[PDB]
């Protein structure tokens, strides 16, 4: 006897998949270039798989479950023995100021939640609730000004002070939409359109 409870919306969608690879680096003590804080606006329109799966429907209400996998490497033969990097991962909610410097107030501001991650431990994890003005996301908008739903931004930097090692790092972000509802089915877009 079969089930059919594997084609459910949550079962179809609630699959984690990398959405971006944010590159940062600990500046060398020579200060050749300042911190490369990585800022990425949360959007599903860069992953073909998630976007295509979401374009089967017009309106959706899905809660995000971001997760961060942190990796790093020395760029020089000399070890330098940099003590384990500490990464600040700040979730700038929708509408809040976007950081423009590695020392901007937005990092220290009270509103923006932040996670502190010591390279080596279990991956960081948050769960952005359904954050939207309307009562359901919209992937297709037939109106005009006077889609592009704002989920927020993620800004990641290295709290540690400069060290002469040039420790580059690449945070992979995995998004698992949970508690997802979808309305108004639509034709699926071809795989060449993206």
């Amino acid at each position: 006897h079969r089930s059919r409870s594997e084609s459910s919306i949550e079962s179809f969608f609630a699959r984690g998949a990398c959405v971006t690879i944010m590159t940062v680096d600990n500046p060398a003590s020579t200060t050749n270039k300042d911190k490369l804080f990585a800022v990425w606006k949360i959007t599903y329109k860069d992953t073909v798989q998630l976007r295509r799966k979401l374009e089967f429907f017009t309106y959706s209400r899905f809660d995000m479950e971001l997760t961060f996998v942190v990796t790093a490497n020395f760029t020089e033969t000399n070890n330098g023995h940099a003590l384990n990097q500490v990464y600040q991962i700040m979730y700038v909610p929708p509408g809040a100021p976007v950081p423009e410097k590695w020392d901007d107030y937005t990092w220290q501001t009270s509103s923006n939640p932040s996670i502190f991650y010591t390279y080596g431990t279990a991956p960081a994890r948050i769960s952005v609730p359904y954050v939207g003005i309307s009562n359901a996301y919209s992937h297709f908008y037939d109106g005009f000004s006077k889609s592009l739903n704002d989920f927020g931004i993620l800004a990641v930097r290295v709290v540690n002070d400069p060290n002469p090692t040039k420790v580059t790092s690449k945070i992979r972000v995995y998004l698992k939409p949970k508690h997802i509802r979808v309305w108004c089915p639509r034709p699926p877009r071809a795989v060449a359109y993206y």
Partner: protein, 172 residues
């Protein structure tokens, strides 16, 4: 007049009365420069979404002998700021007889598609207007001074609400 006590009061003279508003005020708190310091622009400058009905009380600081009428008009969102007395009279207005009343209260209703309207969005500039018009020039006896003053007070109503703290208070 800014940086002093002269900013808060509007002078109702008794000369041109060129059928144009005494004062037109945008109903978008936390975005209007003249309405973003009234303890609604100081609480909505910490939040991102707001959804409620405001309340404007206009008080007339004149003499008991002064008599006349004023016209408080409310152009709902999506309209345009009325620029003549007749158009304002055709809308949603209240005639405020300063002679027998000294304060007029107007509760702007909460009308919007969403449950929460973004506080500071420069795209939405049609949030509605509240304007004051000279229904009838002011009549005063004897040498009573022509110049008079009107004060405005903006408050939230009992069904106001905000959401999504922002806290943009930087220093540098």
């Amino acid at each position: 007049k800014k940086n002093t006590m002269e900013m808060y009061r509007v002078r109702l003279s008794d000369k041109p009365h060129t059928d144009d508003p005494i004062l037109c005020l945008s109903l978008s708190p936390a975005s209007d420069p003249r309405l973003s310091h009234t303890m609604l622009g100081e609480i909505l400058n910490y939040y991102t979404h707001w959804a409620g009905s405001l309340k404007f009380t206009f008080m007339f600081c004149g003499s008991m002998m002064a008599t006349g009428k004023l016209l408080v008009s409310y152009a709902p969102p999506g309209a345009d700021p009325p620029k003549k007395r007749k158009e304002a009279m055709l809308g949603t207005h209240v005639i405020w007889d300063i002679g027998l009343q000294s304060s007029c209260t107007m509760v702007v209703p909460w009308i919007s598609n969403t449950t929460y309207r973004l506080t500071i969005d420069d795209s939405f500039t049609e949030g509605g207007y509240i304007s004051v018009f000279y229904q009838t020039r002011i009549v005063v006896p004897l040498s009573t001074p022509r110049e008079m003053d009107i004060l405005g007070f903006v408050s939230a109503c009992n069904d106001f609400s905000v959401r999504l703290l922002r806290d943009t208070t930087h220093i540098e």
